[PDB]
Protein backbone atom coordinates (compact mmCIF):
# COMPACT_ATOMS: atom_id res chain seq x y z
CA UNK A 1 0.00 0.00 0.00
CA UNK A 2 2.86 2.30 0.56
CA UNK A 3 4.05 2.08 -2.90
CA UNK A 4 0.43 2.30 -3.94
CA UNK A 5 -0.59 5.43 -2.29
CA UNK A 6 2.60 7.11 -2.87
CA UNK A 7 1.67 6.88 -6.42
CA UNK A 8 -2.14 7.60 -6.39
CA UNK A 9 -1.62 11.03 -8.11
CA UNK A 10 1.66 12.58 -9.36
CA UNK A 11 4.38 10.72 -7.31
CA UNK A 12 7.96 9.69 -8.35
CA UNK A 13 11.18 9.49 -6.26
CA UNK A 14 8.98 8.69 -3.37
CA UNK A 15 8.00 5.57 -5.04
CA UNK A 16 11.57 4.76 -5.85
CA UNK A 17 12.81 5.01 -2.29
CA UNK A 18 9.95 3.02 -0.85
CA UNK A 19 10.73 0.30 -3.39
CA UNK A 20 14.44 0.19 -2.56
CA UNK A 21 13.70 -0.15 1.03
CA UNK A 22 11.20 -2.91 0.78
CA UNK A 23 13.67 -4.78 -1.26
CA UNK A 24 16.83 -4.47 0.78
CA UNK A 25 14.99 -5.36 3.93
CA UNK A 26 13.46 -8.36 2.43
CA UNK A 27 16.74 -9.74 1.35
CA UNK A 28 18.91 -9.01 4.27
CA UNK A 29 16.58 -10.83 6.65
CA UNK A 30 14.22 -13.38 5.05
CA UNK A 31 15.94 -14.33 1.67
CA UNK A 32 16.14 -18.09 1.24
CA UNK A 33 14.06 -19.22 -1.72
CA UNK A 34 11.68 -16.40 -2.47
CA UNK A 35 12.94 -13.37 -0.66
CA UNK A 36 15.12 -13.55 -3.79
CA UNK A 37 12.08 -13.60 -5.91
CA UNK A 38 10.36 -10.62 -4.37
CA UNK A 39 13.48 -8.47 -3.92
CA UNK A 40 14.34 -8.94 -7.46
CA UNK A 41 10.82 -7.66 -8.03
CA UNK A 42 11.17 -4.66 -5.83
CA UNK A 43 14.13 -3.26 -7.32
CA UNK A 44 13.00 -3.88 -10.86
CA UNK A 45 10.05 -1.64 -10.05
CA UNK A 46 12.06 1.08 -8.43
CA UNK A 47 14.34 1.17 -11.34
CA UNK A 48 11.36 1.80 -13.56
CA UNK A 49 10.23 4.75 -11.51
CA UNK A 50 13.55 6.43 -11.02
CA UNK A 51 14.53 6.07 -14.64
CA UNK A 52 11.40 7.96 -15.20
CA UNK A 53 11.55 11.17 -12.86
CA UNK A 54 13.49 13.00 -15.55
CA UNK A 55 16.62 14.74 -14.41
CA UNK A 56 15.03 17.94 -15.21
CA UNK A 57 14.79 17.41 -11.40
CA UNK A 58 17.99 15.19 -10.87
CA UNK A 59 18.08 12.94 -7.70
CA UNK A 60 18.23 10.34 -4.67
CA UNK A 61 19.78 9.53 -1.24
CA UNK A 62 18.11 9.47 2.19
CA UNK A 63 18.82 11.18 5.63
CA UNK A 64 18.64 9.71 9.25
CA UNK A 65 20.07 7.15 11.72
CA UNK A 66 17.53 4.67 13.22
CA UNK A 67 16.61 0.90 12.94
CA UNK A 68 19.01 -0.40 10.31
CA UNK A 69 22.31 4.35 14.09
CA UNK A 70 21.25 2.89 10.68
CA UNK A 71 21.60 6.20 8.74
CA UNK A 72 20.14 6.10 5.16
CA UNK A 73 22.41 6.79 2.12
CA UNK A 74 22.38 7.94 -1.53
CA UNK A 75 22.81 7.12 -5.05
CA UNK A 76 23.42 9.13 -8.19
CA UNK A 77 21.81 6.51 -10.52
CA UNK A 78 24.61 4.30 -9.52
CA UNK A 79 24.57 3.18 -5.86
CA UNK A 80 21.90 0.32 -6.27
CA UNK A 81 21.94 0.24 -10.10
CA UNK A 82 24.75 -1.72 -8.85
CA UNK A 83 22.51 -3.36 -6.31
CA UNK A 84 20.11 -4.70 -8.97
CA UNK A 85 22.56 -5.57 -11.81
CA UNK A 86 23.87 -7.60 -9.03
CA UNK A 87 20.92 -9.30 -7.76
CA UNK A 88 19.98 -10.16 -11.44
CA UNK A 89 23.10 -12.02 -12.11
CA UNK A 90 22.45 -13.61 -8.71
CA UNK A 91 19.22 -14.98 -9.95
CA UNK A 92 20.49 -16.20 -13.35
CA UNK A 93 23.14 -18.17 -11.48
CA UNK A 94 20.80 -19.57 -8.82
CA UNK A 95 18.86 -20.62 -11.91
CA UNK A 96 20.69 -23.45 -13.80
CA UNK A 97 20.88 -25.38 -10.43
CA UNK A 98 19.76 -25.02 -6.88
Amino acid sequence: LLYAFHIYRHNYRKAGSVMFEYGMRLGREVRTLRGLQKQVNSYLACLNCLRLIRPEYAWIVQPVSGAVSSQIEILELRDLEKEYVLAQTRLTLAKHNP
Binding site: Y8, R9, H10, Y12, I53, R54, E56, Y57
Partner: protein
Protein backbone atom coordinates in the same frame (compact mmCIF):
# COMPACT_ATOMS: atom_id res chain seq x y z
CA UNK B 1 -28.78 19.15 -4.98
CA UNK B 2 -31.15 21.59 -3.20
CA UNK B 3 -29.87 20.66 0.30
CA UNK B 4 -26.18 20.87 -0.79
CA UNK B 5 -26.90 24.21 -2.54
CA UNK B 6 -28.55 25.55 0.67
CA UNK B 7 -25.64 24.23 2.83
CA UNK B 8 -23.00 25.87 0.58
CA UNK B 9 -24.91 29.19 0.21
CA UNK B 10 -25.45 29.44 4.02
CA UNK B 11 -21.80 28.45 4.76
CA UNK B 12 -20.70 31.21 2.32
CA UNK B 13 -23.08 33.81 3.89
CA UNK B 14 -21.94 32.87 7.46
CA UNK B 15 -18.16 32.74 6.58
CA UNK B 16 -17.96 28.95 7.39
CA UNK B 17 -16.56 27.88 3.96
CA UNK B 18 -13.00 27.28 5.37
CA UNK B 19 -14.45 24.88 8.00
CA UNK B 20 -16.64 23.20 5.33
CA UNK B 21 -13.47 22.53 3.20
CA UNK B 22 -12.06 20.43 6.15
CA UNK B 23 -14.95 17.90 5.81
CA UNK B 24 -14.87 14.55 3.94
CA UNK B 25 -16.74 14.83 0.61
CA UNK B 26 -18.15 12.06 -1.60
CA UNK B 27 -17.33 12.30 -5.37
CA UNK B 28 -20.88 13.66 -5.95
CA UNK B 29 -20.75 16.28 -3.11
CA UNK B 30 -17.23 17.24 -4.31
CA UNK B 31 -18.38 17.63 -7.96
CA UNK B 32 -21.24 19.91 -6.78
CA UNK B 33 -18.88 21.97 -4.51
CA UNK B 34 -16.53 22.48 -7.51
CA UNK B 35 -19.48 23.67 -9.66
CA UNK B 36 -20.69 26.01 -6.85
CA UNK B 37 -17.25 27.57 -6.08
CA UNK B 38 -16.54 28.10 -9.84
CA UNK B 39 -19.85 29.99 -10.36
CA UNK B 40 -19.90 32.08 -7.14
CA UNK B 41 -17.24 34.83 -7.73
CA UNK B 42 -13.40 35.25 -7.85
CA UNK B 43 -12.92 34.79 -4.05
CA UNK B 44 -14.50 31.30 -4.30
CA UNK B 45 -12.07 30.39 -7.13
CA UNK B 46 -9.21 31.23 -4.67
CA UNK B 47 -10.94 28.96 -2.06
CA UNK B 48 -11.27 26.21 -4.72
CA UNK B 49 -7.52 26.64 -5.39
CA UNK B 50 -6.82 26.15 -1.62
CA UNK B 51 -9.09 23.05 -1.66
CA UNK B 52 -7.19 21.56 -4.65
CA UNK B 53 -3.85 22.20 -2.86
CA UNK B 54 -5.15 20.63 0.42
CA UNK B 55 -6.31 17.53 -1.60
CA UNK B 56 -2.90 17.25 -3.44
CA UNK B 57 -4.68 17.99 -6.81
CA UNK B 58 -1.75 20.12 -8.06
CA UNK B 59 -2.66 19.88 -11.82
CA UNK B 60 -6.19 21.30 -11.27
CA UNK B 61 -4.74 23.98 -8.92
CA UNK B 62 -2.18 25.05 -11.60
CA UNK B 63 -4.79 25.04 -14.43
CA UNK B 64 -7.22 27.10 -12.26
CA UNK B 65 -4.41 29.58 -11.48
CA UNK B 66 -3.59 29.90 -15.21
CA UNK B 67 -7.32 30.64 -15.79
CA UNK B 68 -7.21 33.25 -12.97
CA UNK B 69 -3.89 34.66 -14.40
CA UNK B 70 -5.69 35.18 -17.79
CA UNK B 71 -8.83 36.79 -16.27
CA UNK B 72 -6.95 39.31 -13.96
CA UNK B 73 -4.84 41.14 -16.64
CA UNK B 74 -7.02 44.33 -16.12
CA UNK B 75 -7.53 44.75 -12.29
CA UNK B 76 -7.18 48.37 -10.96
CA UNK B 77 -7.14 47.28 -7.25
CA UNK B 78 -3.70 47.17 -5.51
CA UNK B 79 -4.87 44.66 -2.82
CA UNK B 80 -6.10 42.12 -5.44
CA UNK B 81 -2.75 42.57 -7.30
CA UNK B 82 -0.70 41.81 -4.14
CA UNK B 83 -2.93 38.72 -3.39
CA UNK B 84 -2.66 37.46 -7.01
CA UNK B 85 1.15 38.03 -6.86
CA UNK B 86 1.41 35.91 -3.66
CA UNK B 87 -0.96 33.21 -5.10
CA UNK B 88 1.13 33.06 -8.30
CA UNK B 89 4.41 32.81 -6.31
CA UNK B 90 3.08 29.93 -4.10
CA UNK B 91 1.77 27.96 -7.09
CA UNK B 92 4.91 28.64 -9.16
CA UNK B 93 6.83 27.06 -6.18
CA UNK B 94 4.46 24.01 -6.23
CA UNK B 95 4.83 23.89 -10.05
CA UNK B 96 8.67 23.64 -9.65
CA UNK B 97 8.34 20.65 -7.22
CA UNK B 98 6.09 18.65 -9.63
CA UNK B 99 7.57 15.88 -11.87
CA UNK B 100 8.26 17.00 -15.48
CA UNK B 101 5.18 15.03 -16.75
CA UNK B 102 2.77 16.71 -14.27
CA UNK B 103 4.30 20.11 -15.19
CA UNK B 104 3.64 19.33 -18.89
CA UNK B 105 0.00 18.29 -18.08
CA UNK B 106 -0.45 21.51 -16.02
CA UNK B 107 1.07 23.74 -18.82
CA UNK B 108 -0.82 22.06 -21.66
CA UNK B 109 -3.92 23.94 -22.28
Amino acid sequence: EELLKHMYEMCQEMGLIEELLKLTFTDFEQGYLHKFLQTTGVQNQELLLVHHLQRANYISALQLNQSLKTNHLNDCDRRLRERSGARNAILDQYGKILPRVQRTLASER
